[model samples]
Target: MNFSGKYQVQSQENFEPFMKAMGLPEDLIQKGKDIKGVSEIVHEGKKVKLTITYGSKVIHNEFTLGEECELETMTGEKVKAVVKMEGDNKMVTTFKGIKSVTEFNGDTITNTMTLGDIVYKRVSKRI
Candidate 1:
């Protein structure tokens, strides 16, 4: 499945419910909702690349994923990261030690990551 296009981040009011349904904490969900960013995703065969630019937050990142590799980011430093996803939604990212999974529902895409005890989720809507 290849998804290539431009998308805008939906309003917090519209996304919060979906995050809540995914079991995100209210406070965390609110924080995420307050974050302003745009995401672009491209998929070619088994490889995927995703990029996120946060307007309110001073961070820009990209990821490319392929086989037998892992990447992670911690310093909140903004850079272009690339990630690839496999059949089971297993992502091999570019930063090191982080993993991610993406799901698509009609015009919406959801990305979830688990790093240690903290779970991060991002939702995007097709423009």
Candidate 2:
């Protein structure tokens, strides 16, 4: 499956706790908790470009599959990580003890991030 479309956030789980686990400031977390974000993805074979927008904050990242690259997290932290494929529809990444999995299903994508016991899940639909 190709992750090459724009998706708008539908719903999320464990937002505050997950941001806290990622060391985000209380003010930032509170401000972002209710924002419905959007993710734009472009995939060309082995290369992928991702852009995420939350209110005025935008994060843009590009990386090749199976290669180490510096990716900016939600906290704007630059972390070195490699994105790998699971089966054919899932992209998995791990950075600084945090595990992220994005699974594509038809017109929907479910993103799950785990830091120790804290798990944040966000579901988005194609737009």
Among these predictions, the greatest TM-score belongs to 2
Q: Per-residue lDDT for 1-127 in model 2, tens only?
A: 5658898878888888877776878898998787768888787777677787766788888767898877886678888888876536657778877888777678887888788899988887899
Best by lDDT: 2
Clashes of 1: 13
Error of 1 at 107 (Å): 2.4
Model 2 has an lDDT value of: 0.79
Which runs of model 2 end up more than 4 angstroms from their true locations?
A: 20-32, 74-77
Instruction: State, as a TM-score between 0 and 1, how close model 2 is to the true structure.
Output: 0.78
**Lowest lDDT 10-residue stretch of candidate 2:** 84-93
Instruction: List the candidates' TM-scores in order.
Output: 0.55, 0.78
User: Worst ten-residue run, lDDT, model 1?
Assistant: 65-74
